[PDB]
Amino acid sequence: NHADYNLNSPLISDDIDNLIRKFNSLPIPSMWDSKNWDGVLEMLTSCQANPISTSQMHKWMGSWLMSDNHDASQGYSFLHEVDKEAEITFDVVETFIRGWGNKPIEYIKKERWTDSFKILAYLCQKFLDLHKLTLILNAVSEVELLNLARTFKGKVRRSSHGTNICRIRVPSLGPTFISEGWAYFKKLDILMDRNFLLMVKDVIIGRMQTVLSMVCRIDNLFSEQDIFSLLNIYRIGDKIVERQGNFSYDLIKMVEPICNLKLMKLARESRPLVPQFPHFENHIKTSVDEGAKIDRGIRFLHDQIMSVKTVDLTLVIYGSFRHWGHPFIDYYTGLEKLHSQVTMKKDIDVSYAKALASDLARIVLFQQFNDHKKWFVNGDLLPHDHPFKSHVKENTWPTAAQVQDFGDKWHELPLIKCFEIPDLLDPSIIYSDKSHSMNRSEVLKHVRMNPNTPIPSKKVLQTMLDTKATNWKEFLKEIDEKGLDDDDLIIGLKGKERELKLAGRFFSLMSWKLREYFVITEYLIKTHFVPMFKGLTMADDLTAVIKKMLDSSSGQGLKSYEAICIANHIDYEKWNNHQRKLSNGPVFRVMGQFLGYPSLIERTHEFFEKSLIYYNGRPDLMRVHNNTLINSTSQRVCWQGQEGGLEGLRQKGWTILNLLVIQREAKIRNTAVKVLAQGDNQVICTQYKTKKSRNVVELQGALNQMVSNNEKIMTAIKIGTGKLGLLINDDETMQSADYLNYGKIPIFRGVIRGLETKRWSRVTCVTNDQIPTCANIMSSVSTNALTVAHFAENPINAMIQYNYFGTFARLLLMMHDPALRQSLYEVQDKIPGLHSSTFKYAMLYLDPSIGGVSGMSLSRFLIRAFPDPVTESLSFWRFIHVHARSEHLKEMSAVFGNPEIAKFRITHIDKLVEDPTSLNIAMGMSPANLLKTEVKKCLIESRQTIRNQVIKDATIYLYHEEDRLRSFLWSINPLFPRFLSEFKSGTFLGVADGLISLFQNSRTIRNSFKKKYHRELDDLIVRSEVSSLTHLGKLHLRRGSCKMWTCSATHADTLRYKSWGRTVIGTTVPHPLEMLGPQHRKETPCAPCNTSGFNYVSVHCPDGIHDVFSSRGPLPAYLGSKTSESTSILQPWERESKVPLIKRATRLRDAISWFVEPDSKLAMTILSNIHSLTGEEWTKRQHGFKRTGSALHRFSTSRMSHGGFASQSTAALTRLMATTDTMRDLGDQNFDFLFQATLLYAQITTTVARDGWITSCTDHYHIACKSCLRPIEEITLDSSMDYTPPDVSHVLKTWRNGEGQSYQVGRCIGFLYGDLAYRKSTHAEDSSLFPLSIQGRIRGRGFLKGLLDGLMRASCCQVIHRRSLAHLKRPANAVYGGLIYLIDKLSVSPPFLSLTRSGPIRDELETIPHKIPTSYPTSNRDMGVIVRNYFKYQCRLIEKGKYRSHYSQLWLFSDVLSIDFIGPFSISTTLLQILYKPFLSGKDKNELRELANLSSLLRSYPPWGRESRGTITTIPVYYTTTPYPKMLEMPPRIQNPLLSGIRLGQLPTGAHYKIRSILHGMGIHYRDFLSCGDGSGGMTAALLRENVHSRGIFNSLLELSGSVMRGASPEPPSALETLGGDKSRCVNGETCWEYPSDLCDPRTWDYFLRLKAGLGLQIDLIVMDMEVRDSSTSLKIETNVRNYVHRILDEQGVLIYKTYGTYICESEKNAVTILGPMFKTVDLVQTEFSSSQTSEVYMVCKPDWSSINESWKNLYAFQSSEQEFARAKKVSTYFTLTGIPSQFIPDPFVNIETMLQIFGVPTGVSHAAALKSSDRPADLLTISLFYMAIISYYNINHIRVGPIPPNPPSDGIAQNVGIAITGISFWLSLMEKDIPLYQQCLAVIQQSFPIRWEAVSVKGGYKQKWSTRGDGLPKDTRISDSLAPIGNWIRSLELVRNQVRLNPFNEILFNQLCRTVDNHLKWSNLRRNTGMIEWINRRISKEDRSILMLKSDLHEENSWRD
């Protein structure tokens, strides 16, 4: 009403002190005798006591906290009350949770832990009586005083000057005396003001709410001992601030980093082997040493903290740190420190900064030129370098060559406009209520004139109204050219309040021109340049940020060191001080060049250097001369000149400078540098990843190498940043792959965590001046609770705490509510019954949208946003009713969700047009809208006062034509409030709206003093509150209203209908709760839950949600909807920043046809006319724009159109998989429900209702409400009142701006993706899933051929730009090349890739022969393969002949807006016909030049057979009673890619043949089987095809993490493509994943036996290929079979168990474990890989050990390379391919072409090769060696000349050339018969394929050399994971050999091939110079493991939307 509860402004004890002065003897204050203090002096004399003053204040403060000698009572009673109320309200939540997540809860009291409750009772005693003192000393009215006096037992005492001294007795401190703003005295003899008292209230209530929040949770994360430990921490903290006064906060400023350091230490304990970084801990230790040199016990503090054993408790402490906090600021020392840190003279390297500036210019030139493909430089330049050629051509845009050539002069050019200055109309985009200083003459005159009084800050809005507006154009123009005038350069300082630094570090406020300057330039920055930089999270809302928080790939103790992201975070000193001109100048010069006005934005440090600085808190001390303030008294309280700094100015700008330094110094090592820059404070994620560590000392060394690399980066950054004059510290920190800290938000391991302590330590705090009301405190507990919910895991602790802190608050306001000025117990007579179940529930539970007060629904913890408050809560209430196990809850459901509707008025519709979705209620008069009404009213009733023409004309327009718009809008019968609102905003009235709204509540009541309105607003507040509470008392009608709806969405509609006159467009969305209802658990039957059909969402949690925050989690994510919102993470101004007016009008014209059509012409001529009033009439009309889209969620103006966001931790959402693709069957009309919200809801509800489960799980959601599932329509409104936009605003427009068949789908999305992929921005869902709102049916080869078309065109266009015109050689190669690049880029790109996983497109990709995948769900890898493969097939057909586009009717679609497609598409048909046609040159060059200029100016059962059947090496075995145990040779292990390669016709794997060999020789007849442990279903497919009449049970460990399923189910096992798409014979096909697919445990067996008794299978056969990695898991599964076997397996039945030789000789024989009637084991070659211990155990079910030993000697691992090799020859002799149909095999060239293309060569070469392979089957060897050559020369270049070719072994290229050499030389050795190749091969694959590196100088720069037999630099390559591609090699070349013979290696031919395909290089250059001839018989012994010296790239961490 007047002043503030909780804390606003800093401490500054000087006030108190000088009052002690004036009081005491008159030691004299300074100048403040002016003050009215004599009231307090009358208190001081009338009650004589004596103060203590400051340091002592903080002493007794420390003492007084946590004290026992005290009273208690009110504490006990209060808390018990809270307890009771909360029990009731928890009745409500009880039924909610329990009906929602099936888990029931009991209300745990807070009395349970005893001592905790005692502690908390003392704190409550203290807080509650501090709440009283708060209340009293902040009240103006004698009435409030008398009511509080009667309520709180105190009394009024009038003092002689007419000053009321209240006297109060309170149980903590005993007696107290209180007067205007001043307090206390006797008992503890102390004086205090509002500021000090309140910060103490903040303290105690912090401790209170934190202890409260933790003490009893549902999860027990705490015990009274832990709490005892935190309490101890408070005790210690106290003891510090006890021992001395304010100085302790040094040591506290130490507390929060000590906390940081314990955190780091834990998250380091995570993956133990990493070196710690001594830096930070050491620094800390030193700070504790010095701290303990002053005062110890900080020692004990630090110690006990780091003694804390938990994550949580630590995080709490770090969550507090501010407790026992907030010391007095000394602004003197503050200003000294500041001014010095400014004055500091900095060494600056200039040309360094200039090089940065250049780097930037390069950046945005690239971006712009990759956007509009129009170089933005002038053609005025020197006819040289790149530029002339460049801009003239419209692309020279150069290469590495011309970039190296070009110095970094990018900052020197003639740079043009580029970014256009957005129109700022309405204040929203500029102004907030922050203040600013008055001009120079005036401040100076307010120092000369009344001195003693601090000079005020002129509120931005008050000056916005009273001063003539800004001409943005002339402003910037004149600032640019001549700069600002002296009288506008002034900066005021205010000590910001919370800092905890004894320094105080003053926040700044400018003068009006400086204000506007910094704002508009800041806004140009953020709008244009901010986005050109990754990292720098400013514009980011939340979801985006969290994505940027998952730009830390941290965590993973699971995978351990196989990938790591180190994390640096840096703080500087004063970033916002040490900023300097001579550094910042060039870059901001560049930025200036860019935004229209050169040398504009560079004037920052100039305006600082010229300006005045002063601290408006002490004007007395400043003296006036020469338009200068001088310090006089020598405190440095003001000064002239500055070298820059002061906080929030060019935050973004200086941050872009730094971030550029980083991106420049990132280049040094190519290390992966990810960055997050929040203003000052920044973090650098440094990514590395490892290749499969072996000896564990490698981890030590390698990780220490990651550290070394890291420290190098940091050092380069230190020096670099240092050159600019920014001091970086060696005490500023970093952590390992774990932790990270960003803007005080912790990420721990791989996961975000909030400070529940902090949010709950806020609670009852009310924001500035707002004061607590029924609405406000509830609003606070609410928002903070939803925050907690949002950051934590399953949002429950937030719900129960909500209930608690809510009813805590409610009892506080029941005690007294400052709004009603008296207690609410006392008020019963006035207003209806406040004390009821009704009122309680209402106050804390019904939403405002149903029309009651406030406090959520408990439905909002679910979807973070969602656009239907009404439906949401009404749905909630129906739901709590239906699951209510009581009566009065039902009573409350009817009561609540039948809101009494007030009778319609055009007034109300004005309100609920201004905001949509809501309803007309018998209350709802908010202080908000009432104050909006009042400020509208006042602002309107003075339109003649306003000195601003923008605002004047806006107010006029309002006062005149608002009615016209009102009625005109209101007459549209299909009532479309979204459109009425967007139009309403988009009309020139958007100004009126912006400003009227712009005033924030408290700031408004502060700014409403502008006029006669003083009392009205206060009694209006009283009006609103009495009415509110009156509405609840009224809401005790119980049961009086109607009943339980049916599916409240339809009823929310009907209620909206009854609310208004008519029905509404249907903008209401049934929300997930009522429609999807509780979850069906598929682990249970769910069979009645089956609707058949797909009315079914599902979610998977493999491994389950059990323990989270403890690891990152495997699965990718799901964040939410796409479009952003208002940022709630910070508080600068930013809410309405989005979407100015011209853009609005433009966009609702970009609506038109959608829901209106031009045919309507009325609303339309109107729309265009709005666009004509804002602008002029630029309308060309529009036609053919028909849009079929949904009208509820989607329609908006560029703003949030969204469906919702996840309110949940990333944690569970990382352990889950949401699946959508199951629902394709609701395609229907493409109607209401939000897939976004639904998916989100499934996620949360799943997490909540699982809450921990380790057995994994699968969950079903089937639509319960088919009725309010609600099919849509498309209504196109028109109506009319015959309205026209009046009052032409072109005056304003002057002053405002500164002049700102499916082949068709294929071509559309494919060209769109080509072009967009070249622009490099948004890949999101524009490649969508299956028939869209664009409709369709067939999506075939039609879709794909078209895709190739549109895409090819897109590459046509990008290739006219991409290349120099005057070089035309073979344009075919140009365009072909571009499209190749695109295709690869697309096969990597995921959304399209899942799109091709699922659906009928798979077919068109399964028609072409490829190869089967292996990965069960088929990873992005195998998908990329298949996609590429098919495309190389079709594109091959292109590279040969001509490309026809068929069709040629360009069907543009509704999903393509404007010309981003149109122009280039037309131009691309012509351009394909021009460019791909000739294979030549002509006049076309002219045409290219022309058209490219126009573009840049335009943007102004399958057949089958027999198969390989092998030999069985048999081991019969018996077990008779007694053992003869253990004596056995344990085999060796060779990995021998050999035979794994010789298997030729392999489907996903040749285990296929193995099983054939079993069921061949071992003689099984199985009618039906169970195949478990198949990856893609290989052995399944095998069995199933082999015995055609068999049925089978498929089981696969579901390998998820390696693939991103974007809204899709993992799909069938790929292998079952084998059966020709008819999998019907495999019963478990297509459903496989949704059961317990885990074989490690039981329940899977219960499920199989289910499937046995279910389909009557009888399961003759069991087969398990485990591929066992764990003895544990093995013994586990052994026990499983041991249990379930002979109750599942049949009576003649069979069990095959694949076993490992080492593992069976190892310890616990599974052979022993399982012994049935006939028992054996076998080895089967003519299948099995060479030198292999692996063997198939066997049981037919229904001495010996020495024979076992014998057989083990007859086993393969034992046997040697002659057995190995000769056996593989035998296999070579077998026809391994045979009955395989061609669909399955690769094309026995295309695999070669693509492989050589996998190994880095050009496709042309690949193809010439593959041809030569085709042509020369006879002489193969020559061609093979030629592959060796070609891969070698294109990888490592044994020949060429160049200037400095550094280390091009560089890991990978060397890797793939090594493996190439291996596979090749393998099958070569097998052909050419040479053993020592083979021996070598084995020893190599085992260890270290040599690559010995050199660079020799023959001049011309220098040549490069690689070898083996020599020793250079050894990049020697390990191969472990590499058998697979070796296999590919052997397979391919065995596959092209086609059983055909071979002929001698023909050296002549080799030469032919070599010089043909390559430079002229020869067998010679290969022979000696550098090469692989070593692979004749020659090599060297092992040297390096150093590919295990790892590398760096970037990390792939996927979430969906932003």
Ligand SMILES: [Zn+2]
């Ligand atoms: Zn429903």
Ligand SMILES: [Zn+2]
């Ligand atoms: Zn189901």
